[PDB]
């Protein structure tokens, strides 16, 4: 599936994280823009044997069991074909593990050098919430 943008922050206001861990929904929204331009099978295979998966491109050498990668951790407990689904919870799950498990935003490198020091409100602006 390909989200909109407002489609996007409505799901993941839902699955609540909007001011999940001091982070705005318009973080979240920008995150899932630049990452995998709203494209939930969006997969990036990596020459270190990771691949990133969905539309957070979460990696999986430390995230998701897929298998293939050295060093698997698989700290969300999950298969990464999960992260691959029309349906944004899987990913919205790992994605508060992630920084539950002592990580800010900064763990999305999209985030770090495209939404860090914006305005981010831009991404949920004249959006039905």
Not at 14 to 21: C, P, Q, T, V
Not at 25 to 53: I, M, P
Not at 90 to 112: E, H, L, P, T, Y
Request: net charge positive.
């Amino acid at each position: 599936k390909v989200f909109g943008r407002c489609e996007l922050a409505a799901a993941m206001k839902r699955h609540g994280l909007d001011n999940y861990r001091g982070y705005s929904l318009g973080n979240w929204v920008c995150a899932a823009k630049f990452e995998s331009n709203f494209n939930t099978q969006a997969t990036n295979r990596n020459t270190d044997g990771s691949t990133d998966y969905g539309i957070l491109q979460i990696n999986s050498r430390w995230w998701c069991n897929d298998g293939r990668t050295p060093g698997s951790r698989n700290l969300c407990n999950i298969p990464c074909s999960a992260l691959l689904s029309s349906d944004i919870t899987a990913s919205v799950n790992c994605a508060k593990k992630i920084v539950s498990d002592g990580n800010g935003m900064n763990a999305w490198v999209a985030w770090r050098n495209r939404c860090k020091g914006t305005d981010v409100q831009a991404w949920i602006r004249g959006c039905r919430l």
